[PDB]
Symmetry: C2
Subunit: 402 residues, 2 copies
């Protein structure tokens, strides 16, 4: 079999993954699961799969330990940064599913990499924030990364085996990769006007909120752009976007003979997770298959970059390097929270992000060696900390009109 | 480099192929070209590429030899069945492009197979008429077959390398192939009624007339169905059809996790031919790439099998085996000629084909061993000869009302 650890097990990615595990008892054993906030769900999961370890936040450690004992469970309870690292570097773990969202997840993904683990990557931060470092660390120690997000996974499925196994192979001209194409639904304001977009908020949210806001601004796709440059070892000019409201075509690889290879699917994350889990093999995933007879019509159009400024910004960030990508993201974080808490207009998200990318204070730190074996991570998190301060300030100043 | 022979070099497939050759002098040398009717074009081609051999029909051998001499050309002139076989089995030929359409091409494709040649298959008859024999012969002697028709080539691109190399691997469950999907444009009477379809003829004809008629009846797709069963080693139930009027999606492979892999392209045959030529490598093909920004909307719907009876018939033929497939095709041939010469209605094509599949006279020969190393080919051509007689009779009887 294969011993698994799911970092961030109480959300969507966790549900989908564990559903497959149930259908495949004989292939995948759970060794560890984690959850920062959702203690009862974490507990429920623990009672079901009997993991050798679990981890939660520092604040919840005591309650969780008390609960774990009140249930008569053999399971070790960890907490915080340290517990994530232990689980990700554990010698009894063969495969890690990195599903923690946010800067708090980097150290464990880096750890899985350090320890040579198979990694099923399911958060954007690992490569948006720690791009060079994650990839360098994986190569050095022989980790394997396999993307789970729908777009990256489609691209990965549509690339020849040699490039799947060694992403730097994409540069040998014989494989004839010309460019990658990311599809994007255009979010909830595709058909609405530039003027209707300056307004809120249940409208903007209609399916998690932040990610749904990112879909409506198109920051999600810029982020995926930055991730793709690292995942598949390209620069941004080689990766283009097409809008595709239906979201049936998950992405495409263009080859130099004119062949576009593409993955089509439903939204069900069990498809990409099953592919990644069983790679190079395939297994039943338990999804309701896409019905080719009921697609009606798949629309495609060019992205309106004036409306979708976050996408231009992200590409601008990708050109500059790890520093501005750190800034792009952290700023988006603060700016999205702001909109959700009704402090800004939807269109200000981009105004704010731009302001931070340009800030003289932020730029002095771009030239730093964020890829460094030894101080890389410190410098990333320091940069993250700095940009929240500035982004927060920026939101303040925007409101008065500065 | 790689020595090539193009059987049937004066049509579309020939043009497209030779265009790629020109862009790639350093990779592909022409050793032979053939052409049954188009003597001057054949000659023009000969004067350009300086082939070591050419072949034409028996009737045109003399004029062509005279012309070849009047041009001061070193080239050997062959003719008929024998000349095709010589070219296809020639030790100086590494790769054969089987582009001859019609029963007259089988012996040379079998010969290429017998001699261990790489074959770029570009006619339907080889597998529709000589399915088991072609595939058995190729395996025994180590020929490699690579389809060039747009649908089969898309499927082939979308199948893992091990199944590309050995089509019987599609049965190991680890590769997780669930089913193949052929796309079909629905031809020129998709939106028109069952009643408007009973009428002709420039309408039915708006590549060639026959193939365009086959598109309008959907016999082309039934034929492709039968070919796919042999190419990819499946039975017909495992291969489904979806109508797709835009013809951007050339076909899809469905995997057990819900992943549909697909090839998108323009109609330009240089795409599939370049893929097949360079396999496993890729090369520039010289096409105007598909423009993802100008697709507007790709429609998909289920095939209307009442209107598209030829498709039901072909699947019925595929169930029975090589005999009924021979009959299906030969009958279609005669029935299409008939329509083109204004002897029948478009809808009678299916009436006629059905009549022949069901004919007691034809059925006695189904149980024959059409796959036999030694008498296989004789029995196929004999069956072809027989079905023209019957189909011709059938057309006669239909007109009076019997
Ligand atoms: O993996 C799926 N997503 O990240 C959701 C994509 C929605 P979008 O195409 O609007 O970015
Ligand atoms: O490869 C190209 N063709 O076979 C033409 C397909 C037209 P159709 O889908 O109507 O059979
Ligand atoms: Mg995504
Ligand atoms: Mg075709």
């Amino acid at each position: 079999l294969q011993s698994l650890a799911i970092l961030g097990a109480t959300g969507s990615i966790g549900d989908s993954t564990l559903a497959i595990i149930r259908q495949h008892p004989n292939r995948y054993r759970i060794h560890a699961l984690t959850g920062f906030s959702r203690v009862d769900k974490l507990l429920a999961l623990a009672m079901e799969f009997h993991p050798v370890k679990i981890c939660t936040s520092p604040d919840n450690y005591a309650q969780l330990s008390q609960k774990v004992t009140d249930a008569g469970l053999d399971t070790i309870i960890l907490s915080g940064d340290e517990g994530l690292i232990e689980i990700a570097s554990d010698e009894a773990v063969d495969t890690v599913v990195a599903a923690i969202v946010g800067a708090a997840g980097l150290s464990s993904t880096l750890a899985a990499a350090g320890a040579g683990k198979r990694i099923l990557l399911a958060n954007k931060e690992s490569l948006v924030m720690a791009g060079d470092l994650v990839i360098k660390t994986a190569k050095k120690h022989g980790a394997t990364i396999l993307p789970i997000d729908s777009e990256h996974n489609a691209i990965y499925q549509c690339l020849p085996a040699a490039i799947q196994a060694d992403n730097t192979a994409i540069h040998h001209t014989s494989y004839g990769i010309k460019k990658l194409w990311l599809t994007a639904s255009g979010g909830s304001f595709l058909d609405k006007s530039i003027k209707q977009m300056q307004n809120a908020s249940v409208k903007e949210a209609v399916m998690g909120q932040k990610i749904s806001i990112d879909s409506a601004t198109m920051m999600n796709k810029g982020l995926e752009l930055i991730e793709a440059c690292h995942l598949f070892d390209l620069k941004e000019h080689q990766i283009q976007v097409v809008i595709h409201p239906n979201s049936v075509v998950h992405s495409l690889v263009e080859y130099v003979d004119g062949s576009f290879l593409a993955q089509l699917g439903t939204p069900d994350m069990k498809t990409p997770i099953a592919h990644a889990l069983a790679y190079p093999e395939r297994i039943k995933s338990g999804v309701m298959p896409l019905d080719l007879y009921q697609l009606g019509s798949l629309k495609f159009l060019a992205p309106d970059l004036d409306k979708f400024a976050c996408l231009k910004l992200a590409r601008y960030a990708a050109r500059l390097g790890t520093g501005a990508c750190i800034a792009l993201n952290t700023a988006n974080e603060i700016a999205v929270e702001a909109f959700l808490a009704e402090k800004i207009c939807l269109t200000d998200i981009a105004v704010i992000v731009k302001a931070c990318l340009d800030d003289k204070t932020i730029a002095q730190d771009y030239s730093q060696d964020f890829g460094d074996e030894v101080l890389g991570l410190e410098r990333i998190l320091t940069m993250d900390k700095k940009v929240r301060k500035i982004a927060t300030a920026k939101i303040k100043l925007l409101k008065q009109g500065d």
